[PDB]
Design a protein around this ligand. Structure first.
Ligand SMILES: [Cl-]
Ligand SMILES: [Cl-]
Lengths: 200, 226
C-alpha cells in the first residue's frame, strides 16, 4: 500500500501553505477590527460522497449521501478540493441532488481575483465551459484570470475558486466582450465533496 | 482492515485542508484592499466604517452603487463615502440593511471644493463617470492650474474639510464667452468599487464654517499622514 505514504507526503507538503494561510487569516482579523467590521468566521463543513449521477440527459446533477437528517438545505453550496462544484437543489431525508455549476440552469455570481470585476457565470452544459455575461468592449479581463465566488447571491461564501477564464473574444459587430471560463474543480468522476454552512 | 481505513481518513483530511487553502487567493486580495482603506487620513474625532459595494445601479443615465450598510448601521442621507485616495460620493437613499450611493462623477452630483495651493473655492460637478469633474465657469482672471489639488471645503455641511477630491486636469480659456473652463480628475478610483469607508465627521454643533485658512491647514494635516 504505497497509497498510504503518498497521501502522507502530500499532506506534509501542504504545511507551508497552511502556515501562510494562518498568517493571512490573522492579518485579516486585525484589519477587520481596525476598520470596525465583524470578524470572519469559519464555515461548518461536512464530507459527503456522490452516490450516483442523475441519468437525465438534459440536466447535470449528482446524488449525494446526505439529507435533511444531516441538516442539508436547498441552495446549500457544495465544493471539492479544487473549487465550487454546485449547490443542493432537492433534499430527501438521507440523500440529496446537487446541481452542477456547468448545468445550463445554474448561475453563480463571481469576481475576478485580479481586479474585482463582478459578473454572473452561467452553465452551458457540462460539455462546455461556463459563460460569463457579456461585458463592455474595453473590459480588462484576461485568459488565465481566476474567478472566485462573490457571495452576492447570499448563497455561496465569498472567495472560493470557481473557474479560470479560458476565452476572451471581442464581438466587434455588437460591441461587447464574450468570455468563457473553465471550472477549476473536476466535475466528472466525483467522489468526496464538502457541504458548507455559514456560521450563525 | 485499518490500513485502507487509515487512507480514507487521510484523503478526507486532505480534502478538508485543500478546501482551507482554496481561500488563499481571496485572503491575499482582501487583505490588500483593506490595508489600502486603512491608509485613509482621518482625524481623531472622525469615525469610519467599512462597507462593500454590492452592485452598480444598472442605469445608463445615473452612476450609483448600492452598499451593504443601512439605517441599522447608522447610515444617514447625505453621508460621505470615501476611499483612502479621495471622496467617492455620498449616500442618497437609506434602507434598513443597504443604501444607495451617488458617485461624485454623476451629473447630478456637485460638491464644494477648495484649491490647496491658493484657497480658491468653487463647486466641482460630475459630468458622467466617463468624464472628469467640471468646475463651474470661472472668470478669465482665475489662477487655477493643471496639477492643482482640490479638497473638500465643507461649505455644504456634508463633507469633512480638506479631504482629497481631484487634481485639475485641464484649464482652458474660452475667449469668446469670456470665462475659464476647468476639468478635474478624481483622486479616488471610481471603477470596480469594492470596499469603501462610510465617514462620520467630528461634531461642530454651533461652530461656524471653516475658513479658507482652516481648510488649508486641515488638508495639509491629512496629506501629511499619506
Ligand atoms: Cl452567491
Ligand atoms: Cl460639503
Amino acid at each position: 500500500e504505497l497509497e498510504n505514504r503518498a497521501l502522507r507526503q502530500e499532506l506534509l507538503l501542504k504545511n507551508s501553505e497552511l502556515l501562510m494561510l494562518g498568517q493571512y487569516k490573522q492579518e485579516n482579523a486585525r484589519l477587520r477590527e481596525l476598520l470596525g467590521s465583524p470578524l470572519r468566521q469559519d464555515e461548518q463543513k461536512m464530507v459527503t460522497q456522490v452516490i450516483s449521477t442523475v441519468n437525465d440527459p438534459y440536466s447535470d446533477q449528482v446524488v449525494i449521501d446526505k439529507g435533511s437528517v444531516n441538516g442539508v438545505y436547498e441552495g446549500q453550496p457544495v465544493i471539492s478540493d479544487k473549487g465550487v462544484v454546485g449547490q443542493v437543489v432537492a433534499v430527501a431525508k438521507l440523500t440529496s441532488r446537487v446541481l452542477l455549476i456547468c448545468d445550463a440552469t445554474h448561475a453563480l455570481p463571481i469576481q475576478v481575483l485580479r481586479n474585482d470585476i463582478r459578473v454572473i457565470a452561467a452553465g452551458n452544459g457540462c460539455t462546455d465551459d461556463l459563460q460569463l455575461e457579456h461585458l463592455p468592449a474595453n473590459t480588462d479581463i484576461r485568459v488565465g484570470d481566476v474567478l472566485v465566488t462573490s457571495g452576492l447571491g447570499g448563497r455561496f461564501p465569498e472567495g472560493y475558486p470557481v473557474a479560470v477564464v479560458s476565452s476572451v473574444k471581442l464581438d466587434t459587430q455588437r460591441a461587447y466582450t464574450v468570455i468563457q471560463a473553465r471550472p477549476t474543480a473536476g466535475l466528472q468522476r466525483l467522489r468526496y465533496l464538502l457541504l458548507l454552512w455559514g456560521a450563525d
